[PDB]
Design a protein around this ligand. Sequence first.
Ligand SMILES: [Ca+2]
Ligand SMILES: [Ca+2]
Ligand SMILES: [Ca+2]
Ligand SMILES: [Ca+2]
Lengths: 19, 19, 148
Amino acid sequence: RAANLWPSPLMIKRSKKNS
Amino acid sequence: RAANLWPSPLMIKRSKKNS
Amino acid sequence: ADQLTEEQIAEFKEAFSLFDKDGDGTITTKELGTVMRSLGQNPTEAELQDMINEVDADGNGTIDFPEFLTMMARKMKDTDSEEEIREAFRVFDKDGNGYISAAELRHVMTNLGEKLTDEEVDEMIREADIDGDGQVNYEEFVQMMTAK
Ligand SMILES: [Ca+2]
Ligand SMILES: [Ca+2]
Ligand SMILES: [Ca+2]
Ligand SMILES: [Ca+2]
């Protein structure tokens, strides 16, 4: 299920935005 | 788009109301 | 702000009858495609679909009378609450309609590393959509990962 992929781009965004 | 298309049949509608 | 005279807009309500053709008070892709087929012969299947998405400014997925006036008056959209998630949303939205349809993830997930199959694109949003309305709004987007 791509569901885990849902949080991936959003988490990566949060990480990138936090960096 | 919609705003151009919508008035088109709408114009025909006017003609239909006039008919 | 301001208001609209329903009595004067009654002439426009004729579009919810004559334009509608079926007479249900709701413009959908079926009847629209019918009218555009006899009085158009140009808009394709994907065209009438995008066209309807060019009318629905509320994102309820249904042509309603209140938005009818908006479409034929002021085509402007604000944005100022989705700050960080906006940076993600502009990429997640793709088409620019707020809600996630499916084709959008078909780009961000395929560019996530692996390849996103159209068969999993439905299963993924069905897991995303907490309400079960069939759409992904900013509300459930933040109230899923960011909100523990
Ligand atoms: Ca109808
Ligand atoms: Ca609508
Ligand atoms: Ca979208
Ligand atoms: Ca939802």
